[PDB]
Design a protein around this ligand. Structure first.
Ligand SMILES: [K+]
Ligand SMILES: [K+]
Ligand SMILES: [K+]
Ligand SMILES: [Mg+2]
Ligand SMILES: [Mg+2]
Ligand SMILES: [Mg+2]
Ligand SMILES: [Mg+2]
Ligand SMILES: [Mg+2]
Ligand SMILES: [Mg+2]
Ligand SMILES: [Mg+2]
Ligand SMILES: [Mg+2]
Ligand SMILES: [Mg+2]
Ligand SMILES: [Mg+2]
Ligand SMILES: [Mg+2]
Ligand SMILES: [Mg+2]
Ligand SMILES: [Mg+2]
Ligand SMILES: [Mg+2]
Ligand SMILES: [Mg+2]
Ligand SMILES: [Mg+2]
Ligand SMILES: [Mg+2]
Ligand SMILES: [Mg+2]
Ligand SMILES: [Mg+2]
Ligand SMILES: [Mg+2]
Ligand SMILES: [Mg+2]
Ligand SMILES: [Mg+2]
Ligand SMILES: [Mg+2]
Ligand SMILES: [Mg+2]
Ligand SMILES: [Mg+2]
Ligand SMILES: [Mg+2]
Ligand SMILES: [Mg+2]
Ligand SMILES: [Mg+2]
Ligand SMILES: [Mg+2]
Ligand SMILES: [Mg+2]
Ligand SMILES: [Mg+2]
Ligand SMILES: [Mg+2]
Ligand SMILES: [Mg+2]
Ligand SMILES: [Mg+2]
Lengths: 23, 96, 66, 137, 86, 208, 116
RNA sequence: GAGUUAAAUUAUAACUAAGCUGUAAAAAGCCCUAGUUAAAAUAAAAUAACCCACGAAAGUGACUCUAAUAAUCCUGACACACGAUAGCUAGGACCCAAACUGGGAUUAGAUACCCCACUAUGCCUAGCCCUAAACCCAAAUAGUUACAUAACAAAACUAUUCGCCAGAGUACUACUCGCAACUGCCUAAAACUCAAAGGACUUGGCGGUGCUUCACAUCCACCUAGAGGAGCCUGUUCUA
């Protein structure tokens, strides 16, 4: 199902929001 | 039914009325075609899956000397005739 | 017991129920149903003539009928 | 025998007296049947409390007091204390929806107390305070 | 709080029984939908859930009331078949 | 089971056959028993038409049996009734005028009454809910209560008796103790009532 | 009367926004659902409570609780009789409405036609 | 915009009671509490609604009044105006709900689900931010039911016109322009890696998914006799 793409974009955005916070 | 529109004379208070003028023309050819195939020694089968005239139709074929099938119809009867009926079976030449 | 030949040399089936798959069973059903109508017709005529000369002989318990 | 479900309106004069007193003179039995406790209190026509009883005061503790049997025992105890002060008929008012509604109703009946009218006064907001969130159990 | 007391949602017992009177009161509340309303007000449902709940209640009500009509419409066709073994 | 479904339990009471003319419905019951030609099982060895037997005695005798020694179980049951009878006869002699017609000298009457006082009224059954077990009281059926009373009698006299005291004499004492509502079995019955009454609010868990 | 199904579902030729979003299509089946078994509840509670009162009031001795003990036994037999007979009769009692097996056959005789 | 309040709740007062809240079960908290009677403010709008209306969309359904819903009735952007909720700046309100935080419980751990307390905030006035599964995943205006079933779903298609789409990951990212934005929004690549990624469907297995029915040594409820404790006999592992 299409959830396999939303989850992939979910992780990348979640990891991006931690890269900004750390630096 | 959509394909019965040309054969309907009209509708009377929601009840469709069949145009007998077209019925007479069709019935005239139907009886004419039925007799000719019987003249040439053809097998005629009466088929009717209706549980109100099954006995009447079944007796009708017996008087005419022809065959009738008003019972449950098996799936592979007319198509897979050799297995259902026998090795060599002559298929009916007309079905009513 | 073996089935007899169901058609002649020209292929015409002998019985009028050969195309129903089970000619023997349906012929018995057709005759049995026809007897019921004749009994009903005969009973209807008897009721019209106001005569009841028949009796129920189904009860065969002492004989042990099944 | 024409019997009307609706209560006798105080404005009119209905010749229906229990124990020699009118409809409004009969004391009141307030029943608060919560989801964990059932509290029973009887008050007079002048809203003066007579007796108080609850599942907690009858020895039941914690989850036990929320059962129907606990409310049934409270009704018997409340009626016994009420009957000591000399009350025969009472109008029972039920507050809220809970497991102890049926038990408290028949608890008073078996406790030597007679009820004649039943009133449900469950707090029903009409749009009001926002209740708590859901429980994802 | 401002209205008169012992008028709304009130019943009176007859002949001295209380179980029968209470069941009459419950039918009044169930018919008016208060019993289910109190159940749904114990917790708060978001407006997203409220519309999703009304889109399932309405669908069930249409299907149930349509299947029921067909049952009654075809109810007369349950007599003994007059053409058994025909 | 070598007996098929058609076989039924035979009737042993002779009096059931000797006076059938006083009733009509019961006559139809047994006249059709053989008219239907239903097969009848063989008579059990334990049960007999002797008027001196009692069904409660046979069940109690079977429970005392260990292994396959029916003779030893019957011998122990015979002495136990004798032991009770001797004690009751001895107590009757040493009694006053009003006390003489109080003591019961019938061991069968004592045995039947003793078990009817040791039967618990309400039992307990564990119910699993929420990952834990709650002792929920239940209205035990009559057969279970009758069976449970016999088991308590056997368990008590087998365990906490002295090695010197014989089985028939020890069981005789408990029958008298239970006949006066003061035996340890009666105490055990009350203890089960104590637990059932304490967990009276957990009866809502059961669904029957 | 059946609620109107006009301008409700999401369709191309519908200007009004959707009002209903069914999980499954609203097509009548050829069979009805089976009856749901009624969940049981604890029985003989009003009779057990009064029995416990006498036991606590008489040191757990049935010397004076005979009236309460018999009623508890009577309730147990009454509950036992009703429990072991509801299942067999309810299947064919039908409360005036045909059992699910008979309704399924009746619907098969007059099926719904989504196709053609 | 202006005015207004039914039902509930709370400050608060009187009276009675010793307990009150809470869970599958408890603990913590409270005892300045709980029940009944009397009662502002703030906040939110049962039944009607099984109705489907208004607005361009996001939205709106307690009452009353005022003002009021473009175009003589095509398409159209990066331009002008608007845009739920969360968030920011300043002032005011705070019943109640409530991220964060503290305590209780659960667990191997639980900085989670469950329980209790309380803050931001949800609210009013003025300004900003301009993001959503902003999805009816179906663009606007005229039409046709002819032709014709990939699959699934909400049947198929024609005319004019605009926007958008060129394998997947890297990527609602780096760099760049604008912005009352400064942990932001919009615009949006490449190096490199792989020969696949992706939509729908079929059968099978499985499901701490639901409904119905059933275990006669059987899962529970329940019956009897035993193993695990000791010696001995014998068979494995390890040691040798
Ligand atoms: K309102
Ligand atoms: K499958
Ligand atoms: K061993
Ligand atoms: Mg990634
Ligand atoms: Mg008010
Ligand atoms: Mg519109
Ligand atoms: Mg769906
Ligand atoms: Mg204030
Ligand atoms: Mg504590
Ligand atoms: Mg208070
Ligand atoms: Mg709407
Ligand atoms: Mg417009
Ligand atoms: Mg307009
Ligand atoms: Mg334009
Ligand atoms: Mg905004
Ligand atoms: Mg906001
Ligand atoms: Mg805000
Ligand atoms: Mg800032
Ligand atoms: Mg502020
Ligand atoms: Mg605040
Ligand atoms: Mg709070
Ligand atoms: Mg913590
Ligand atoms: Mg939307
Ligand atoms: Mg879109
Ligand atoms: Mg759109
Ligand atoms: Mg456009
Ligand atoms: Mg337009
Ligand atoms: Mg159009
Ligand atoms: Mg292409
Ligand atoms: Mg690429
Ligand atoms: Mg984004
Ligand atoms: Mg960015
Ligand atoms: Mg660049
Ligand atoms: Mg086993
Ligand atoms: Mg041994
Ligand atoms: Mg050993
Ligand atoms: Mg060994």
């Amino acid at each position: 199902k299409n959830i396999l793409k939303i989850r992939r974009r979910k992780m990348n955005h979640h990891k991006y929001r931690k890269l900004v916070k750390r630096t | 039914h959509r394909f019965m529109e040309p054969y309907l004379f009209g509708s009377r208070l929601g009840q469709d009325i069949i145009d007998l003028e077209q019925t007479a023309a069709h019935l005239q050819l139907a009886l004419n075609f039925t007799a000719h195939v019987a003249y040439r020694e053809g097998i005629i089968l009466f088929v009717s899956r209706h549980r109100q005239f099954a006995h009447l139709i079944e007796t009708t074929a017996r008087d005419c000397g022809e065959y009738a099938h008003t019972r449950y119809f098996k799936g592979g009867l007319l198509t897979n005739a050799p297995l259902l009926l026998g090795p060599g079976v002559r298929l009916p030449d007309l079905i009513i | 017991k073996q089935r007899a030949i169901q058609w002649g040399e020209d292929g015409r089936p002998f019985h009028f129920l050969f195309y129903t798959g089970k000619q023997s069973y349906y012929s018995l059903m057709h005759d049995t149903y026809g007897k019921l109508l004749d009994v009903e017709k005969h009973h209807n005529q008897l009721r019209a003539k106001d005569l009841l000369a028949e009796k129920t002989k189904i009860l065969k318990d002492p004989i042990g009928s099944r | 025998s024409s019997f009307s479900i609706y209560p006798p309106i105080p404005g009119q004069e209905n010749s229906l007296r229990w124990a020699g007193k009118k409809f409004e003179e009969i004391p009141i039995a307030h029943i608060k049947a919560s989801y964990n406790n059932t509290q029973i209190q009887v008050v007079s026509a002048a809203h003066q409390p007579l007796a108080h009883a609850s599942c907690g005061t009858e020895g039941f503790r914690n989850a036990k007091k929320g059962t129907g049997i606990a409310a049934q025992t409270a009704g018997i105890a409340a009626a016994a204390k009420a009957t000591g002060k000399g009350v025969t008929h009472v109008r029972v008012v039920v507050k809220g929806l809970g497991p102890g509604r049926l038990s408290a109703i028949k608890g008073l009946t078996m406790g030597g107390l007679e009820v004649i009218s039943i009133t449900d006064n469950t707090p029903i907001p009409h749009x009001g305070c926002r209740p708590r969130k859901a429980r994802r159990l | 709080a401002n209205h008169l007391k012992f008028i709304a949602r009130t019943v009176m017992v007859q002949e001295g029984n209380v179980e029968g009177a209470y069941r009459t009161l419950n039918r009044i509340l169930t018919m008016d939908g208060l019993i289910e309303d109190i159940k749904r007000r114990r917790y708060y449902e978001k407006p997203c859930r409220r519309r999703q709940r009304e889109s399932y209640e309405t669908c069930r009500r249409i299907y149930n009331m349509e299947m029921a009509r067909k049952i009654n419409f075809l109810m007369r066709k349950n007599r003994a078949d007059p053409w058994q073994g025909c | 089971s070598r007996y098929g479904p058609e076989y039924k339990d035979p009737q042993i009471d002779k009096e059931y056959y000797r006076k059938p003319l006083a009733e009509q419905t019961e006559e139809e019951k047994y006249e059709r028993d053989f008219k239907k030609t239903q097969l009848i099982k063989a008579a059990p060895a334990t049960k007999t038409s002797s008027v001196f037997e009692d069904p409660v005695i046979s069940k109690f005798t079977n429970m005392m049996m260990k292994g396959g020694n029916k003779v030893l179980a019957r011998s122990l049951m015979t002495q136990t009734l004798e032991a009770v009878k001797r004690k009751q006869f001895a107590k009757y002699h040493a009694a006053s005028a009003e006390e003489q017609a109080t003591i019961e000298r019938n061991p069968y009457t004592i045995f039947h009454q003793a078990l009817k006082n040791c039967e618990p009224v309400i039992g307990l059954v564990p119910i699993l809910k929420g990952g834990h077990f709650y002792q929920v009281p239940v209205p035990l059926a009559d057969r279970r209560r009758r069976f449970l009373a016999m088991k308590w009698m056997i368990a008590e006299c087998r365990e906490k008796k002295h090695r010197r005291v014989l089985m028939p004499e020890k069981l005789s004492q408990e029958l008298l103790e239970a006949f006066h509502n003061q035996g340890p079995v009666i105490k055990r019955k009350h203890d089960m009532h104590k637990m059932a009454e304490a967990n009276r609010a957990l009866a809502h868990y059961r669904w029957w | 009367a059946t609620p109107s199904l006009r301008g409700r579902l999401a369709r191309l030729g519908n200007p009004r926004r959707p009002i209903l979003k069914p999980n499954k299509p609203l097509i009548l089946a050829n069979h009805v659902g089976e009856r749901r078994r009624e969940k049981g509840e604890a029985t003989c509670i009003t009779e057990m409570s009064v029995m416990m009162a006498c036991w606590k009031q008489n040191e757990f001795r049935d010397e004076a609780c005979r009236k309460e003990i018999q009623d508890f036994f009577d309730c147990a037999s009454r509950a036992e009789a009703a429990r072991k007979m509801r299942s067999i009769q309810e299947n064919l009692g039908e409360l005036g409405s045909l059992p699910p097996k008979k309704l399924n056959k009746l619907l098969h005789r007059f099926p719904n036609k989504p196709h053609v």
